[PDB]
């Protein structure tokens, strides 16, 4: 294998949601899973996280899940399921909060989490080399290209720039914090 349970369940969850979106249409699934877009939805607490389970395009779910499978899968195997859980919770929540602050609540997608994993794995490898986690030269070039693609919006639709900044920030900061230990 390769995929621990956290890596696996997120992939399954993104695929199931994506199917639901093809059947029902994107906005019907946004109605249930999006960041609260009405004051009356503020207590539906799953919404602060489930915006990360929705994808609007085949190419973005494929690349997000590929990066999640690789980096998420590495974090879980070398550092544990719980570490991947907390990275994911924190990046999904802070990236969603930053995204809706700048541009409102109609956003979705795992990249916020993917950007946190990229920054986490890269920085942790650079500072704490022999905890077993690092991003190889080649892959970080391709991560850097992916990041530049989103910043200059070389993609189909509008990019969630605040999600994307906040997620990377979360990842670098947690890697820094985890690097102080030894």
């Amino acid at each position: 294998e390769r995929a621990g349970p956290v890596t696996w369940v997120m992939m399954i969850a993104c695929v199931v949601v994506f199917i639901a979106m093809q059947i029902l249409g994107d906005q019907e699934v946004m109605l249930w899973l999006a960041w609260p877009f009405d004051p009356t939805l503020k207590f539906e607490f799953w919404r602060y996280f489930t915006h990360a389970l929705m994808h609007f395009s085949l190419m973005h779910i494929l690349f997000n899940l590929l990066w999640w499978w690789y980096l998420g899968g590495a974090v879980e195997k070398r550092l544990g399921s719980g570490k991947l859980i907390v990275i994911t919770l924190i990046s999904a929540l802070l990236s969603g909060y930053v995204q809706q602050k700048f541009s409102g609540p109609w956003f979705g997608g795992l990249s916020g989490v993917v950007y946190a994993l990229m920054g986490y794995v890269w920085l942790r490898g650079e500072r704490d080399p022999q905890s077993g986690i690092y991003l190889q030269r080649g892959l970080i070039i391709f991560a850097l290209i992916w990041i530049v693609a989103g910043w200059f919006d070389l993609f189909g639709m509008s990019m969630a720039n605040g999600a994307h900044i906040a997620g990377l920030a979360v990842g670098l900061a947690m890697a820094f914090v985890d690097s102080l230990n030894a």
């Binding site: 956003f107 997608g109 990249s111 969630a160």
Partner: peptide, 4 residues
């Protein structure tokens, strides 16, 4: 709409 924004993608993430």
């Amino acid at each position: 709409q924004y993608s993430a």
